[model samples]
Target: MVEPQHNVMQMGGDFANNPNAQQFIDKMVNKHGFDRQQLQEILSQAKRLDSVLRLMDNQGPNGAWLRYRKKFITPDNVQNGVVFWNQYEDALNRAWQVYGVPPEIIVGIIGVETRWGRVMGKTRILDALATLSFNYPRRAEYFSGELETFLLMARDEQDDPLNLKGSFAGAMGYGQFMPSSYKQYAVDFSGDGHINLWDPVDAIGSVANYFKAHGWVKGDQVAVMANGQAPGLPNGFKTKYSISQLAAAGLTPQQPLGNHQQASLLRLDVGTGYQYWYGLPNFYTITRYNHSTHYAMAVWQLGQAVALARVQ
Candidate 1:
């Protein structure tokens, strides 16, 4: 609509008139077999979001571990998390035993994402995805793909797209799963033939399934606060090397280590300064959920805190 380079909107979604809009519709119709009339009507109504572009351009967090912790981890979150966990203890425990993922971890992610179903979101998912899909140059391709999957998801579920709502980034449900994540990882825990991520029971099982799919080690510890010194860690955020190797390089886990244990050696900024960690395979497994050490750490820490409160 406004003057811009690519990801700009010339028209709303008239596939017949605008070449830009037509291409998407064509792909959806010919490739995905969407109803042409249905798409036309929906696309025309899809509003271009200037706010999405602005937000994408300015992701204003400094990405410090301490700040991320302070924002997501608090007494309020922990308290509510304890209550939430207790309320869903049956499903949570089943998910834990079946999936080898813990209740508190599932509780942590859902609590952090939406305060355990208190706020799902206000923006229509269609609007958010379409706006990003067409009007955000940097990630338009990804968002466009998500939009297609979302439509496909709606069609498969026989759900109404107009009624669906999600975050500005198009993440939905308790875990804030993207369209593909919902399609692939979301589970029918209720056994009613529906993957109801909105429902606590379904959300619990689905989050557990996600972690299990991502290689959560059975009964393994996700994180451990370590001290002493170490050689340089691998430059990226992924898990690499064995505890034996890192110990040889000078850092050691406070819990003592087995030579065969594989882990990621990480350092996070605590309130005062950096704290060392033995980021076990389970910890790395958590990062697969969000791809950030801080996120996984918060989930790890929050889960433990919630567990502690539950017992108290």
Candidate 2:
């Protein structure tokens, strides 16, 4: 028998009185035909004050960058990266031809997401997402939206929603794609009618397809370290700037593109010094995967490393 613990409901008093929570619960029950009692149990169990605190406090820009980079450099991870590339070489090549995204980037995304599908988390996706939505105030709205998408994905896949498990963030399968991204970009690479993200081929293809649809330029450099002074650093670092504007500002990479090429600038700290890099159109395309510079860099670096190791 499972040991009983203190009820989370007692700790989640704020959620109990939240009108949005009530409305969300009501919609789940009335619109989706979910059982109110079961949902109440789910919501009660979803309270995660500790996890919320950790996520919020431990996720500043510096901390996030450090955490993101550690995943790629481990020796075992690097070996596994090469293995994944070798195993999916055909599909990777096919995706490259079709989508114009290199196989390395696709492989890198999969590598980072699930360790090439070895560790796709064990938490029930419903509970994890619902907990964040109801209990985590910081990003409650985003998780709630994802919960809705999770429900739809379950229904569309004809899978039992309660049985599905994924990351705490509700990302799932080989590439760890969120439900919305899955719905928008995943494809049936195996020609089996259903889009099976659990399959490496499908996941690799989908990753490539996502980059391509987001305007990944063929053969364009993903990033280039700024070795010299960039006298022309654009006025606003956060604002999206065109390639021409960046070039005019004297922030150009070794690889020359047409004057009309689009790009963005990124600044990352690597302990010793600040590293500035030029993000070409392909780099912007990669940000669509996770919307973080460190994430994109990790993916790009890992992908390139994997491709080189495997091809060599």
Candidate 3:
């Protein structure tokens, strides 16, 4: 039996008395056919986590990319990732054959998400989702949708909602997928008859499947180191330019881009100065997993580093 890991400082909530919660319960009963009393009982145990609320309100500076890079791109992280790669060699290779996503890219995502499952989460998933759904005004609707999906997922899996634990943001398992992503992309790659994200084999297959579903091109380049400043810093990673266009503007990929390939020039703050790279379509696909240029870069770099370590 799995034990509850609630923090002592958290206070239980009276969700039954909250009108918003009552309406939500009613929606579940009417729309999803959930038992109202059961949902109420489950939600009653949910604590109003002021800590989660405060965390949601805090957005760290963008210039912290260098700090974030240091966190994931360390010798220890690469070594740990190499260990995972070596252990799951067959599964990783099979994922590449079936889904067209490289093993190292899968490793990079899992590593960046939770340090190879060493730090999946510490908060009650029910409490975190409920608190954000009701109390966090800015993203209340978004969190409410996730809360609804979480309930449906719990029901579909025949799992106890109260027993589930995850990140303070309600992201779960090794990949830290939100409720919707888990419902949509998670696969039972281990052939265990049930999709389990906590299992590394399933997580590997699921991550590769996600990239494939999101338009990952096999054998296409993800990113390459580049010199010279970019003409513009487009928001996100959708913007693209032909190799010749970028070369003319003084920003060029260190490696050749073949003939007629397009890529986006990405600028990252590297502490001492700015560094740049050419982000290809596959790179943009990585951003679909996490919508940040810096995040995609880190995933690519970390994956490359781990792959190099594995070969050596």
| Candidate No. with top lDDT | 3
RMSD per candidate (Å) reads: 6.0, 5.9, 5.5
In model 1, which runs have C-alpha deviations exceeding 4 angstroms?
Answer: 1-20, 59-64, 231-236
Per-residue lDDT of model 3, residues 176-224, tens digit only: 8889888788898998888777889988999999999999999988877
Distance (Å) between predicted and true CA of 33, model 2?
Answer: 5.5
Give the poorly placed runs of model 3, Cα more than 4 Å off.
1-12, 60-66, 231-238, 259-261
**1-312 per-residue lDDT for model 1 (tens digits):** 743333433434422354545677778989988766667777787766677668777871233777888877799988999899889899998998889888878998897778898888877888888878776768878888888889888888888887788788888888888998887888988788988668889888999999999898888777666776564665235757677777776776778554437777787765565567777777878888888887888887888899998788
Q: Candidate 1 lDDT (Cα, whole model)?
A: 0.78
Ranking by lDDT: 3, 1, 2
TM-score of each: 0.87, 0.77, 0.89
What Cα-based lDDT does every candidate model obtain? Answer: 0.78, 0.72, 0.84
> How many steric overlaps does candidate 1 have?
0
Q: Which residue runs does candidate 2 get wrong by more than 4 Å?
A: 1-22, 29-49, 56-70, 231-252, 260-262, 268-274
- Clashing pairs for predicted structure model 1, backbone only: none
Quote the lDDT for 96 in model 3: 96
- In terms of lDDT, which candidate is stronger, 2 or 3? 3
